[PDB]
Amino acid sequence: IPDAMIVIDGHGIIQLFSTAAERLFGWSELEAIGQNVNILMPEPDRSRHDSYISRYRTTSDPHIIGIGRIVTGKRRDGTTFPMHLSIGEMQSGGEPYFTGFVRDLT
Amino acid sequence: IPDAMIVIDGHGIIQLFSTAAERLFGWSELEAIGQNVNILMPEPDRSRHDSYISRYRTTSDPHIIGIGRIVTGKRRDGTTFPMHLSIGEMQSGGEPYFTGFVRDLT
Amino acid sequence: TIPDAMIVIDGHGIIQLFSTAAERLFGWSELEAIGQNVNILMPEPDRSRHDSYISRYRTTSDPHIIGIGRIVTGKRRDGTTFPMHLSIGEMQSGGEPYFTGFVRDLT
Amino acid sequence: PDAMIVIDGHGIIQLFSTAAERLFGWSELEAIGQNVNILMPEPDRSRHDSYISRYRTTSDPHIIGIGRIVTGKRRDGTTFPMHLSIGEMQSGGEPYFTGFVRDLT
Numbered sequence A, B: 001i002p003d004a005m006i007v008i009d010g011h012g013i014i015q016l017f018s019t020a021a022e023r024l025f026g027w028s029e030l031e032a033i034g035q036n037v038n039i040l041m042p043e044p045d046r047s048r049h050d051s052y053i054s055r056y057r058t059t060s061d062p063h064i065i066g067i068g069r070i071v072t073g074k075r076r077d078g079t080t081f082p083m084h085l086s087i088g089e090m091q092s093g094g095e096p097y098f099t100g101f102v103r104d105l106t
Numbered sequence C: 001t002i003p004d005a006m007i008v009i010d011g012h013g014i015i016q017l018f019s020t021a022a023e024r025l026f027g028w029s030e031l032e033a034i035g036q037n038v039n040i041l042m043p044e045p046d047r048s049r050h051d052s053y054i055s056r057y058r059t060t061s062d063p064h065i066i067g068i069g070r071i072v073t074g075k076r077r078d079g080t081t082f083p084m085h086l087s088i089g090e091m092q093s094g095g096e097p098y099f100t101g102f103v104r105d106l107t
Numbered sequence D: 001p002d003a004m005i006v007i008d009g010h011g012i013i014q015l016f017s018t019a020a021e022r023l024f025g026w027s028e029l030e031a032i033g034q035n036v037n038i039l040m041p042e043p044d045r046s047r048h049d050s051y052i053s054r055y056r057t058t059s060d061p062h063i064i065g066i067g068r069i070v071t072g073k074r075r076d077g078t079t080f081p082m083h084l085s086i087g088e089m090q091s092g093g094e095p096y097f098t099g100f101v102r103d104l105t
């Protein structure tokens, strides 16, 4: 049943990668944790994603947080697929984390 | 940064339940989803938790969101344990969800 | 009456207890506040001097705020400040002094 | 984390810490507004009001600043040994008493 869930820290590093995220993206949770979230997308988003997070931390002007967007994901096997993305922010131990929920559109 | 994560909707219904949550509380994600998150807690919190959610949706005045709190959790086998909670708020598909990080303090 | 935001420190300003209402007011959970100096809860230069306030009190026994209370400026985890009324008590446990603080948010 | 209770100076519970709830079995909301004498067996239970009143008149302490091992009572009625430390503080010209409870079990 459930959609894929990914948590990142304030610098884009994967901290949690749900069971449905493993099935969808192909990475095991252990492989995904400690990698930049930018591994889960094609170019050009892959190269720009660090700047997207940094721009948000500086300005607190959201573009997908609380808004959602249809984007293209990339699996461990290199294939791409359309997906809808919802993102949230929270604080834990005084530091920011971002929660993403991924609906596989295919 | 704890590995146990739970996501609820705006009525306290479990939407996602991470593998570490499963081990800690003793409920599988498949069983957990669709149940109120209050199954994971002892009284008196159990019977009041819906009112805490509704109160927050009314006031927007967090008691735990962005602050954190040590509370008592209850496992499926009825045993209780100290845990720290970090809760965040997010929106997906136009509705609120709450993201909870659970740190077992046993 | 008395406030529900209560803080207990030892004789060196280290937080020992941090009540639920104090967590909400200051934005720190007890897990992180306990073991830190109470001076984390105040702006400068009070923060840098608060240890001296306590230690000089323990040597002189001349109270300023104890038993009287005072409106002071507090500071939250997120760095925002706010006026607050502070009531302080002193007690002994196991031959060591502790101080009990009750905080009223005046925002 | 240790059990703390604050009374007014008729013995009514004002604050009841999380460790206090775990120890005595009363929720904070239940405890607040009850006389602290609920937390002890007889004969102390029936006499505790007089002890506070006697302190307020005489200012002669017996446990304040001194401490004592006494017997406490849980909500479920069971008794247990505990060490108590008590302090006084004022606000509004009215005393409040702060109690720290060590469960000796």
Ligand code: HEM
Pocket: A006, A007, A008, A037, A040, A041, A042, A045, A049, A052, A053, A056, A061, A062, A063, A064, A065, A071, A072, A073, A074, A085, A087, A098, A099, A100, A101
């Ligand atoms: C895997 C496919 C993903 C793609 C293609 C993607 C793409 C993008 C894009 C295009 C933006 C900038 C939006 C704009 O400027 O219009 C952005 C921002 C951001 N993304 Fe992602 N992202 C993906 C996954 C994630 C995940 C899983 C998370 C968190 C777990 C995340 C966190 C963020 C954050 C925190 C921002 C800054 C906040 C904002 O601008 O609203 N991203 N992303």
Ligand code: HEM
Pocket: B006, B007, B008, B037, B040, B041, B042, B045, B049, B052, B053, B056, B061, B062, B063, B064, B065, B071, B072, B073, B074, B085, B087, B098, B099, B100, C020
């Ligand atoms: C399982 C053990 C849990 C316990 C004992 C518990 C207890 C509480 C308490 C006591 C409050 C109110 C604070 C107060 O009135 O002083 C509260 C509020 C709330 N809880 Fe929980 N909770 C638990 C788990 C969760 C989880 C896992 C989530 C979300 C995934 C959650 C979501 C919320 C929300 C949204 C509020 C209101 C927001 C706020 O006041 O900051 N709870 N909870």
Ligand code: HEM
Pocket: C007, C008, C009, C038, C041, C042, C043, C046, C050, C053, C054, C057, C062, C063, C064, C065, C066, C072, C073, C074, C075, C086, C088, C099, C100, C101, C102
């Ligand atoms: C967080 C905001 C606080 C501020 C801005 C603050 C400020 C001060 C100041 C300015 C003094 C010296 C008073 C003077 O000499 O005129 C003082 C003394 C003192 N404070 Fe604090 N304080 C704070 C919190 C606390 C808390 C929560 C406690 C105890 C739980 C505490 C315990 C003491 C003690 C024991 C003294 C010396 C006793 C006395 O002067 O009567 N303080 N504080």
Ligand code: HEM
Pocket: D005, D006, D007, D036, D039, D040, D044, D048, D051, D052, D055, D060, D061, D062, D063, D064, D070, D071, D072, D073, D084, D086, D097, D098, D099
């Ligand atoms: C729950 C178990 C408790 C027991 C068995 C107990 C027992 C006693 C006894 C025997 C005395 C008289 C001392 C004497 O005459 O030698 C006394 C006095 C007193 N108690 Fe308690 N007490 C308990 C809890 C508390 C708590 C939790 C507080 C405050 C938060 C408190 C506040 C006082 C005060 C203010 C006095 C008078 C002050 C003094 O004589 O030092 N008591 N108590």
Ligand SMILES: [Cl-]
Pocket: C092, C093, C094, C095, D065, D066, D067, D068, D084, D085, D086
């Ligand atoms: Cl003592």
Ligand SMILES: [Cl-]
Pocket: C093, C094, C095, D067, D083
């Ligand atoms: Cl002792």
Ligand code: NA
Pocket: D028, D029, D030, D031, D032, D033, D034
């Ligand atoms: Na009550």
